[PDB]
Design a protein around this ligand. Structure first.
Ligand SMILES: [Mg+2]
Length: 292
């Protein structure tokens, strides 16, 4: 019975990045500006973030009165029409909705057109703390809140692939997964757009699976609760040892869970989300019992 703290959404006059602010060296101006029209349907309003795949735009949808949408870059034959069909067929309150897939000559790769989620990301919430990490019981609460969205994908034979604090948005008293473009079928072929430091080691060689999604849940939960060593711009593999982490010495069952979720061998992890949820509830109770 986790009660997530209500996060008030930011006002509309604070959604866009200010175009008159100087940019950090190495970043190019947005290719679309306010007033541009994409695919004779979306009226560009501005940018909300600059990600690894480029700028991320906000726009008005003419087909539905008052609808505001995100234009996010798609990653690079006939199955492509079937995969886009599946993404628009996803129906779950914990997953951002996909409305369309469009092209524009000014932005190579095209856009996915998706619902805008107002709240801040879990990475933003971590940054709001003096040590840059969340309270362990609260981080577990966030993980438990996104497990239904993950298990829904798994029941459809697909995986999220790129779970990490920056693409989980906390709005009101809920969380939404927002990285729709990363979803693939279980066992899909081709390059999987996970993130090094979060992705399971076997994805590049055997493809993604429910087990590899479990792995990203464990790494995400670790990144939310403790500083993690970095090696060449990548979170180092493994969970820190209890002998080096006072947090993990305090909650040894939390360490055991993180280690099991991120075991090298996929056969040594949790088999599915429900099996992980059960152990998460137990760890949360042991944590609340030791602390209080
Ligand atoms: Mg991603």
């Amino acid at each position: 019975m986790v009660e997530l703290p209500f996060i008030t959404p930011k006002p509309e006059d604070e959604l866009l990045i200010d175009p008159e602010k100087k940019r950090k060296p190495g970043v190019a101006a947005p290719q679309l500006v306010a007033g541009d029209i994409v695919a004779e349907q979306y009226e560009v309003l501005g940018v909300i973030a600059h990600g690894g795949m480029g700028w991320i735009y906000l726009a008005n949808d003419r087909n539905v009165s008052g609808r505001i949408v995100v234009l996010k870059g798609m990653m690079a034959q006939g199955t492509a029409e079937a995969e886009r069909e599946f993404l628009a067929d996803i129906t779950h309150p914990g997953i951002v909705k996909a409305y369309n897939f469009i092209d524009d000559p000014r932005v190579p790769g095209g856009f996915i057109v998706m619902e805008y989620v107002n709240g801040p990301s879990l990475k933003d919430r971590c940054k709001a703390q003096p040590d840059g990490v969340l309270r362990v019981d609260l981080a577990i609460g966030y993980i438990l809140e996104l497990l239904p969205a993950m298990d829904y994908l798994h029941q459809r034979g697909v995986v999220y692939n790129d779970l990490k604090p920056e693409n989980v948005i906390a709005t009101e008293d809920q969380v939404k997964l927002i990285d729709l473009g990363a979803v693939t079928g279980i066992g899909a072929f081709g390059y999987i757009y996970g993130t090094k430091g979060f992705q399971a080691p076997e994805v590049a060689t055997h493809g993604p699976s429910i087990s590899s999604d479990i792995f990203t849940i464990g790494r995400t939960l670790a990144a939310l609760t403790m500083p993690l060593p970095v090696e060449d711009g990548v979170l180092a593999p493994g969970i820190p040892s209890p002998k080096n982490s006072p947090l993990l010495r305090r909650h040894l069952s939390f360490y055991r869970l993180l280690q099991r979720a991120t075991a090298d061998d996929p056969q040594h992890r949790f088999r599915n989300v429900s099996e992980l949820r059960t152990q998460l509830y137990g760890v949360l109770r042991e944590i609340l019992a030791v602390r209080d």
